[PDB]
Every structure is written in structure tokens, then in C-alpha cells.
Design a protein around this nucleic acid. Structure first.
Lengths: 215, 226
RNA sequence: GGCACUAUGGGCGCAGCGUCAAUGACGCUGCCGGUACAGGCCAGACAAGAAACACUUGUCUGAUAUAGUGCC
């Protein structure tokens, strides 16, 4: 069987100065053949720890590796600003080699509720035979957020796609964009298109909606 | 400081097609270390693929590629290779080759990696975007500010460039990551937040540029009123 | 796997010939099976060589082993 590497947390929100520990557990004994990496968006990985506890040459000492059996935790004693990135465990105990899925470290800030906007389809797009209905949630924290589309109160599945921004450089908030796709015909069969936004900064789920053919 | 690895030769290739990545070494003799290929899907994590061993030519594969990919080295050229065959939509990624260090110095840790080459596999032809305004109005106003934007719809391949007022407008914009539609095309939107009172007083134009299809599109976004 | 019992063609008995199987097992003889020292050699383990495997070189286990059964 191939060895499994599964990481926890899958993402972690912390602030500079935090003690951060990322854990990773192999599905069989892998002795100490475990490597850690830091990867920043768009750039290639950088080795932090080898032999599961050997601090790689030139990597700052706030990084350290640690083992208990199949338990591998990479810990950073005191988070610094250039540490916000993705982290990886890897087993090189046997071929085939295996990476963990990755723990992204994001900047913790005060809860910020989304501003919700919705946009009905253009007259231009509807002329093409397609209707795309867009909901924007703007400048929120944390990332976790339910977007639920309703067409005449029917909950939608399998007809929407979401996209999220990277944490903002200046307010460390995110923006998400859910777009509902319908055929033009499917669109004119109904009246009320709605976006339901459920979030921690909101007392209760907020909804933005429109009626097909509204001024 | 002087070790460097330079992948080269990736690109678009149709499903079932073949592509040979290169991995040029410099700063060290490639023969005495183990050389890998790692891939990373768009937005996904790193996925180990392949390796070839010093002095033996022992090669290894991950299950997902076994029997299609052929890792090799050419020590006269100080270069490693990845031959890829019967490529699939799933094989779309940025590919790194990596040097596993010297045993006494870095264990089996990968101490140098290339900057990666982009391998995109699709049956999708090149196609310039449709831009459709996301018109501002009520339902897109939260007090002093309004949200407005453009939908860049049904283009291939990545990337497009989206600027506002030919670059003059930048702060408060978000251009979103492309999302791949089950049609094999990409599609994104870009939104801008502005002070609401400017809706009558400042014009706004999304500038959508998609070099692969050599199309440049300006869409004036105008409010909807009543 | 561990334990306990029991047995013990050199860790390398082959002319070997097969078979499964992709290489060790299996089977089948036939000789020889006397005894011990071997040489040599092989396999496992480990270590180092720019070194996951392979290789080279070094030690080490090869009755502390090997096997059938019983037992958790």
C-alpha cells in the first residue's frame, strides 16, 4: 500500500508572534524520512526541515521539526510576517513518495461581515442564449462562507461556481464571487433569483434577490 | 548559492498527446544526486511524480502516471527529462524537477527546485472572451459605495488581463481567479467598488485583454436606474 | 508476531528435470546420503562511498538459525 500523508489544520489563521504547530500523520511507519516545505503563491517550494527534525541549512531557528511515531508536527515558535504561506510534509521513506495536502497560514484579524451585491444577467449576454447571475461578497473575514442560490425559493445545486481572492494585502480580507449559470430558457421560466449569504459576522443569513424584469 | 535548475518545454497539448519537459542543471554535477519531478495542479497541492537515482538509473513512478511517463537523465548534458505520454485533462499542472540533496547534508530532502513549467492539456480551442457588464445599481449599493464590474466569459486559454479605465483605476478592484467550465473554457468576473455618488459623475470601462486570441475589449459599464 | 512443543540433505546435497511462477518455491526421481575441518561461496542485516534500489567495500546473523504444530 502507498503511505498516506494527511495534514491538520488544512488552513490556520494566526497573527505575527503566534506559536503555530502544523501536524501530519503517516499511514504506516515512515521512521524519520519526513521533509517540510514552505511554498508562497506563484513561487516554488523551499525546504525547511529534513529528517523530520533536522533544521535545513540557512532556515531560521523559529522553525523546528518534531516526531512521535507517525506524528510529525512542524512548529514555528514565533510567527513572523514572511511566514504566511503554505506548508508541506513529505515522506521519503519509500517510493512512491507522498506529500500532505497542505496547511495554508492566513492573517488573523477582527471579524468583518461581507457586503453582499447581486447582479442580474446583461441584456447582451441574454441575447447570446445564456444567463449568468453573479453574487459578490466583499471584504470579509474569515474565509468560511455559504453561498446558496434560490430560484423561486428552490435551493440550487450544480449550477453555480465560486471564486475567492487571496487575503488582501491592506485589510487582510477576502472577496468571493459565485456565478449562477442558466440557459436563457431556464431563466425566463422563473421570476425570483436570490443569493443567500451565511457568515460568522452576520447575525443571520442575509439574502440579495431580484425579479426578472425589474426596473 | 550557485545551484540552479531550469525546467523548459511545457505547453498546451491535446488529450492523448505527448510533451517532453527538460530540467537543466548548473552549479553541480547531476550524476551523484537523485532528481525528481513534482507537479502541482492549478490551485491544488504538490504531487510527487517521478525520480531517478544516482549511479543506478533506478527510476520510480507514482501510480497516477505509471506506464505513461518516462523519467530519464542525460549526464553529458547535465539534464534530466520527463517524457509524458497519453496525456489527460488531469495532467494539467505546473511541473517542478527537484534535486534531492546530498545524503549527509540534507537527508532525502529536496534542497533545490526549478521555477516550474506550465503543462495545460485540453481539447479546447483558443477562443477570445465575451465581456458582459455587471451593471451597477440598487441591489449593488451598500451606502456610500457601489459595486460594479465585468464578466469575462468563455475564453481559452488562460490568462486574460483586466484593467479599469486603461489602468487609471486600480484601488478597490478585485479580479477573480478563473474557473474552468465543464465546456473546457475558463470564465471570470472582475468587480470594482466606487463611491455611490460617482455613478452619475464618473464613467467606468473594463479593459479585457486576452493575448492568445489576440483580442482587446473595452466594455463601458453603465448603471441601471429606476 | 510472540510463546511453547516437536522435528532438523551444508546458510550454498545436485545430475537435475520439470511445474507454479516471473522467480523463489513445488514435485520428482537418481546417486551420494558416514563423520568432522574446510576453502570457497550465497543470502539476509547493517555501515560507508557524492549512495532509498542497484553497485563497490567493510563487519555481522546464517541451531541465537530453520521448520511443523499448539496457543493468544
Amino acid at each position: 500500500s502507498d503511505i498516506q500523508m494527511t495534514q491538520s489544520p488544512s488552513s490556520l489563521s494566526a497573527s505575527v508572534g503566534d506559536r503555530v504547530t502544523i501536524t501530519c500523520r503517516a499511514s504506516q511507519s515512515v521512521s524519520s524520512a519526513v521533509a517540510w516545505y514552505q511554498q508562497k503563491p506563484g513561487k516554488a517550494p523551499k525546504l525547511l526541515i529534513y529528517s523530520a527534525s533536522s533544521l535545513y541549512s540557512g532556515v531560521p531557528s523559529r522553525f523546528s521539526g518534531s516526531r512521535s511515531g507517525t506524528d510529525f508536527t512542524l512548529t514555528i515558535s514565533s510567527l513572523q510576517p514572511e511566514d504566511f504561506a503554505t506548508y508541506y510534509c513529505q515522506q521519503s521513506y519509500s517510493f512512491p513518495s507522498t506529500f500532505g495536502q497542505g496547511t495554508k497560514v492566513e492573517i488573523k484579524r477582527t471579524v468583518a461581515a461581507p457586503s453582499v451585491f447581486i447582479f442580474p444577467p446583461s441584456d447582451e449576454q441574454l441575447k447570446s442564449g445564456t444567463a449568468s447571475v453573479v453574487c459578490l461578497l466583499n471584504n470579509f473575514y474569515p474565509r468560511e462562507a455559504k453561498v446558496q442560490w434560490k430560484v423561486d425559493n428552490a435551493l440550487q445545486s450544480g449550477n453555480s461556481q465560486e471564486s475567492v481572492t487571496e487575503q488582501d494585502s491592506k485589510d487582510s480580507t477576502y472577496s468571493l464571487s459565485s456565478t449562477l449559470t442558466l440557459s436563457k430558457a431556464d431563466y425566463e421560466k422563473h421570476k425570483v433569483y436570490a443569493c443567500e449569504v451565511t457568515h460568522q459576522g452576520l447575525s443571520s443569513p442575509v439574502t440579495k434577490s431580484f425579479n426578472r424584469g425589474e426596473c | 548559492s550557485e545551484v540552479q535548475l531550469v525546467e523548459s518545454g511545457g505547453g498546451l497539448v491535446q488529450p492523448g498527446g505527448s510533451l517532453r519537459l527538460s530540467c537543466a542543471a548548473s552549479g553541480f554535477y547531476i550524476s551523484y544526486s537523485s532528481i525528481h519531478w513534482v507537479r502541482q495542479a492549478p490551485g491544488k497541492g504538490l504531487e510527487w511524480v517521478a525520480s531517478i537515482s544516482p549511479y543506478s538509473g533506478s527510476t520510480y513512478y507514482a501510480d497516477s502516471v505509471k506506464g505513461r511517463f518516462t523519467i530519464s537523465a542525460d549526464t553529458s548534458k547535465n539534464t534530466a527529462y520527463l517524457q509524458m505520454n497519453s496525456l489527460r485533462a488531469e495532467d494539467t499542472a505546473v511541473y517542478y524537477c527537484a534535486r534531492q540533496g546530498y545524503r549527509r547534508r540534507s537527508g532525502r530532502g529536496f534542497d533545490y527546485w526549478g521555477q516550474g513549467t506550465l503543462v495545460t492539456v485540453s481539447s479546447a480551442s483558443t477562443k477570445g472572451p465575451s465581456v458582459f457588464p455587471l451593471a451597477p445599481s440598487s441591489k449593488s449599493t451598500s451606502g456610500g459605495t457601489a459595486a460594479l464590474g465585468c464578466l469575462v466569459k468563455d475564453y481559452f486559454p488562460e490568462p486574460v488581463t483586466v484593467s479599469w479605465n486603461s489602468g487609471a483605476l486600480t484601488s478597490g478592484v478585485h479580479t477573480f481567479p478563473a474557473v474552468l467550465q465543464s465546456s473546457g473554457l475558463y470564465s471570470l468576473s472582475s468587480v470594482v467598488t466606487v463611491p455611490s455618488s460617482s455613478l452619475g459623475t464618473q464613467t467606468y470601462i473594463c479593459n479585457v485583454n486576452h493575448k492568445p486570441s489576440n483580442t482587446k475589449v473595452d466594455k463601458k459599464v453603465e448603471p441601471k436606474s429606476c
